Symmetry: C3
Subunit: 485 residues, 3 copies
């Protein structure tokens, strides 16, 4: 007796296919990454700029509450709170704020130079402060200078600066909007003041917009700050008859490319990632994850799925070709050195023997299928998270419409890819067993009867050495011409 069978085990591993659901399989592979390390790490050897609970505005201006900030010269992404607590301690806005944040998202190299020393403002008062930026005496943004009148005079304030630092330089200035005409006169003496700033390409003139406002942080006044990148060997001109908040420092900056701000509560924790999420770092080979949409780095695609499992083994039986769970009704728990093999009732022993060469062709194939699915996915560095003012609601909605559009597409493709390929994997094994059976039938023919359960009854004495002529595809028909039929 010779029998063609297939492998079985104690697996409870389930998969879905196009045609059937919850189908138990021999071996399987999850291709969806769902675990992180819950840490917040450094991105490819380069740390994040950690802001604690300051805002970029607050950090750059020199809010006294950002003094203990600790600044690296490099950083690869920024960490901020979804709602920071130390920003403009003096009320105001920041022109093109989001553009500025996006510009500082990632940096070479970035250092703070002193470009316009306080004391050189010789005809003006410099110590101007406010209870709003208080340390319990009134202080002010440490990087800026509030030029006010000296005595009863405010002469034209006018300085320039040639960018000799060798690198593109970020420079910030501001204009102060008083609460009323009287407060204007006591700070600046003059009424029709203006702030004028100009470079080669920049060319801007502001005038104070005096108006009655509710108090924010106990102040009815406001400051509107602006910023420019001063190109190398170019000069920036300030001229003002009042209301200027002058920079004292500039920031040398260089960039390789762009990145993201990560909105989170966590804190850098000393490690390494190629891919960071607000919940933790991801180290994975798999092509999909479902951890968090807002990642930074080279990440697996984010999918709205919570199971993506490829069958690799075979239908676990305690098809399209009619073999597995077909004319060969069940699998063999015994044979464990292959996926398909032989079982023989003889006069010596009996008798499980794996078909190495056919199990090998299949380990190769299925290994290739898995690797096709995984290795064909392209993962370049991206930043996902994005920033919009509350007058860019449409733009923000456009961005969400896009992220969501790709999310729907990848999920659908993934789900269906897994389902379709699982149906073909099973048929694959089913075909392999069926061709095994046939690779024996077309060879025995008359020296055996077709029993049914994938068995052949021998018309002669087939000792262990004859049973090996069948297993290795080299059985001779001529030799056994004994007709017991």
């Amino acid at each position: 007796q010779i029998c063609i069978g297939y492998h079985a085990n104690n697996s409870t591993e389930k998969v879905d296919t196009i045609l059937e659901r919850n189908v138990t399989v021999t071996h399987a592979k999850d291709i969806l990454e769902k675990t992180h390390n819950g840490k917040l790490c450094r991105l490819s050897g380069i740390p994040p700029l950690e802001l604690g609970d300051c805002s970029i505005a607050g950090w750059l201006l020199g809010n006294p509450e950002c003094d203990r900030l600790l600044s690296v010269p490099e950083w690869s992404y920024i960490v901020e709170k979804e709602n920071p607590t130390n920003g403009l301690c003096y009320p105001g806005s920041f022109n093109d704020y989001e553009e500025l944040k996006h510009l500082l998202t990632s940096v070479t190299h970035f250092e703070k130079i002193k470009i316009l020393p306080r004391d050189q403002w010789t005809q003006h008062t410099t110590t101007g402060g406010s209870r709003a930026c208080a340390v319990g005496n009134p202080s002010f943004f440490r990087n800026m200078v509030w030029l006010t009148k000296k005595g009863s005079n405010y002469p034209v304030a006018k300085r320039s600066y040639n960018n000799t630092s060798g690198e593109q330089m970020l420079i910030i200035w501001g204009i102060h909007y008083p609460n009323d005409d009287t407060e204007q006169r006591t700070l600046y003496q003059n009424v029709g003041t203006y702030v004028s700033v100009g470079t080669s390409t920049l060319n801007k003139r502001s005038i104070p917009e005096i108006a009655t406002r509710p108090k924010v942080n106990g102040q009815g006044g406001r400051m509107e700050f602006s910023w420019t990148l001063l190109e190398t060997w170019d000069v920036i001109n300030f001229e003002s008859t009042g209301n200027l908040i002058a920079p004292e420092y500039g920031f040398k900056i260089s960039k390789r490319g762009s990145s993201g701000i990560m909105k989170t509560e966590k804190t850098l924790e000393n490690c390494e990632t190629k891919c960071q999420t607000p919940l933790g770092a991801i180290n994975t080979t798999l092509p999909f994850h479902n951890i968090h949409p807002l990642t930074i780095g080279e990440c697996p695609k984010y999918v709205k799925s919570d199971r993506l499992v490829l069958a690799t083994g075979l239908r676990n039986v305690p098809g399209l070709f009619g073999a597995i769970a077909g004319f060969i009704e069940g699998g063999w728990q015994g044979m464990v050195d292959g996926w398909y093999g032989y079982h023989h009732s003889n006069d010596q022993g009996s008798g499980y023997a794996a078909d190495k060469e056919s199990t090998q062709k299949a380990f190769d194939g299925i290994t290739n299928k898995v690797n096709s699915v995984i290795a064909k996915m392209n993962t370049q560095f991206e930043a996902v998270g994005k920033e919009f003012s509350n007058l860019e609601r449409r733009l923000e909605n456009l961005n969400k419409k896009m992220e969501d559009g790709f999310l729907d597409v990848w999920t659908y493709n993934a789900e269906l890819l897994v389902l379709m390929e699982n149906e073909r994997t099973l048929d694959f094994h089913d075909s392999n067993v069926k061709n095994l059976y046939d690779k024996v039938r077309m060879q025995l023919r008359d020296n055996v009867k077709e029993l049914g359960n994938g068995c052949f009854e021998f018309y002669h004495k087939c000792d262990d050495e004859c049973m090996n002529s069948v297993k290795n595809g080299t059985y001779d028909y001529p030799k056994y011409e004994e007709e017991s039929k």
Copy 2:
């Protein structure tokens, strides 16, 4: 004698496959929804704000032509004509208009409130009107007040409002731009006038731009409107020496999400949908539709295709496994209670009996195939259509480039899905038939003769309970040892 066969009927359904075109099939399912109810319906219980032929601006300002408007307090989307006939009856612009429309696109909750009563502008005149907003007497936007001179004086107009309504409040104001220096004085006496508006975050000061302009609605002047959201318990301050168009009303407003403006002339009708289009509402389980690109709601994916028919039954004849339309050269008109079955020529009679074991595995399977294709589609709520000013041409083009890009992707994938899955459905049936035939052959053997056209000729007698033993898989070889050969 027992024949193996498969179902055929009078159907004329055609599907396409990867390898074949116009292939007549037994049963099919169109997975492309292309019918609407020609009605404009309310969305998950909540109706649309119907603007008739007014613009949002005309509505909010109180254009007199928008009096019999009817205003719901809720609304889930807005209906507006492509080009409304009642907007600014007095010529002018509206700062950040598109952002405002996007804000009002859906709403909790929306209530107009008198916040600055006219008659309390005690030192100014209120009955300012124009022929441009005629009723046939000069009139004006009903929600605004045109402050002008009282005698030969226009003092500092200065009022404020604390938002005690417990909701976030929309507030609009405008400044006037006269056609020439003389028109100005007859209206405001003063010449260096300004308009000042402040809140906690708002801070604005506008000055009039006197200049000769072509007459729109017989008017050379222009009115430039602005708007802000005043937060709860915050106060807004107005101050002006002339040219201020003050609001009388504010609008309490709350929001959960965003929605969209649907261009169309149809009117609300009193039905319901999860999904609306400018042509009619859609009610469907199907994953795709081709009615119209600009839907609002939880919709199927829009595709360029105009036919996605999924084969569910089998090839219909008067394959890959070479049974169907192959070695069994035809289907059976007769048999109608299964897809595959038997036909016995016996001394009692004949002979059609469907096969319930395999026909059920197929219903099961093809059912799951359809459900997988449908139930994997992710359908959240979206609004598609958007709005852009004539200086956001690039941004609009970005949006189109985006909507067009997904359209191409979903079309291609749906078209190919159907083509591939159809080829594999037919091969599924072809296989089920081939396996039936094989399950019978492997049960008889010696006891019967393989004819060629799918039949077995018995080498012995076989009454009815002889067939009912083969069909159910319970046939015992040993009992029949007559070898008429």
Copy 3:
């Protein structure tokens, strides 16, 4: 004897399937276009507007270095260098420049009309020039008029123009920002000047800002230009007390759709395409290419792949159904008129004969498969390249994140489509052979013996007439009852 077999040849064409790599195939089709003509062509009959090394700004204003420019009236895209040498010869900015470039991207119809002739500026000096626009006396943009004082006076400059031209007209004006108070007097005499421009919808008043600036092209002053579309039968009104840079010309423009600007150094070169890239033109039926991402026209999808070969022939051997390179161990070099066929050994001769019928079914099926993959692709017209100022980094990053999104999607889908469909083409051929073999075995039966690699040994005499019957499917069992067994 009669044997079934398949085609083989001397191909070294290789394809990848889901299960195998580097598989040598009988015939194949590359579906990735990889070649361009290196020419810069015209798009569907319509040329590009070529700018040499001017910028659109310099071209419209009429920079004297653009005299040789060659202006056509139609054009389907614009060719510009990455960084053009002749732009604003006199330093300045250009309000909403990117929107203007986008406007002019494609054009009907485009024609320069003389709308405000120089000489009619009778109260002012017109020949105002600058050394910055030297010809080697001072000159100026040829399409603009630099109004300066005549004698010691500069009367209110006031002119209007009503667009009677039958098309929408683009108009450009400018305001001069001088370097210092004396430059202003020597040019304009007056002190608190203004520039007023108005139409139906446009309404701008501009006062000049005198300030000290770095010198660019030797100028401290700056000129800011603005533009508008003057609709038909509308009028534009200029009024100015100095500092106006007036138009002399407007541009009748008409637009069907939109296009793009192509950045490259190449020149128009007198040929044709439906699809243009900065490297050269593409003439192709294929659905995919990898030449360059920035195309213009009706183009194949761009993918990161650099090999998309579709198998069309069978495994080459000099599978899933166990025929090809399976139970029939190899192919026939010498069957050159079909994919599958017969080899008869006869008393007469022997004996390769291609099977016309089934080879055709295959040529048909694979033709369809290739046409389905190619023809389902949606090649609408798009421009791709896009322009953003340096304060639109976010917006530009938004666009990049989108182009990449689609690139990643199309690439993955194409790669896997090929792999999956290759796996099934091979298995298709395999199936055809297996079935042709069975179509003989079921037709002979007793009358022949199953030998080995697809061979049947006849139990009777078979002449070249009997042979033909087996081949054409007519052979009869009854006739030949010679039972040499």
